[PDB]
């Protein structure tokens, strides 16, 4: 059988954080109370390029970080920080201009505590694009 339905296109996406408890010697000029080194990221599977449809990713850190709104406008869409605590990060994904799409809003709790060495908290989901316009569909299908 055949039917008409609304067009959708999905793009797999990997996001979250890795982390490590720092040793006795800490990186120079890291605040003395910071205990961990960590990295929050949005990336493609197998580290394939995602900048063909993502223009920039904005990570809102906890207010204890200076300039907590951290805008990453070229790949890799990640940032590395030191710190002492776990907290929620609002991740704002902005698509290329052609998408004509509003921001994609989501949230990730920074994981630092060990498992029940390196820890990670990583999700492997997908972004579904509802009714993409013809030009954006062309861009999405180019990779």
């Amino acid at each position: 059988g055949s039917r008409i339905k609304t067009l959708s296109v999905s793009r797999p996406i990997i996001y979250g954080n890795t982390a490590k408890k720092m040793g006795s010697v800490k990186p120079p000029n890291a605040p003395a109370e910071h205990t961990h080194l960590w990295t929050i990221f949005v990336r493609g599977p197998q580290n394939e390029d995602i900048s063909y449809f993502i223009k920039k990713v904005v990570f809102k850190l906890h207010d204890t970080y200076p300039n907590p709104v951290r805008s990453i406008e070229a790949p890799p869409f990640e940032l590395t920080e030191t710190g002492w605590g776990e907290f929620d990060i609002n991740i704002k994904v902005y698509f290329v201009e052609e998408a004509n799409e509003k921001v994609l809003n989501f949230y990730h709790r920074l994981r630092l505590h060990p498992y029940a060495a390196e820890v990670s908290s990583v999700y492997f989901d997908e972004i579904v694009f509802n009714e993409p316009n013809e030009e954006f569909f062309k861009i999405l299908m180019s990779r």
Partner: peptide, 5 residues
């Protein structure tokens, strides 16, 4: 924000 376990 809380220090980890």
């Amino acid at each position: 924000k809380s220090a980890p376990a």
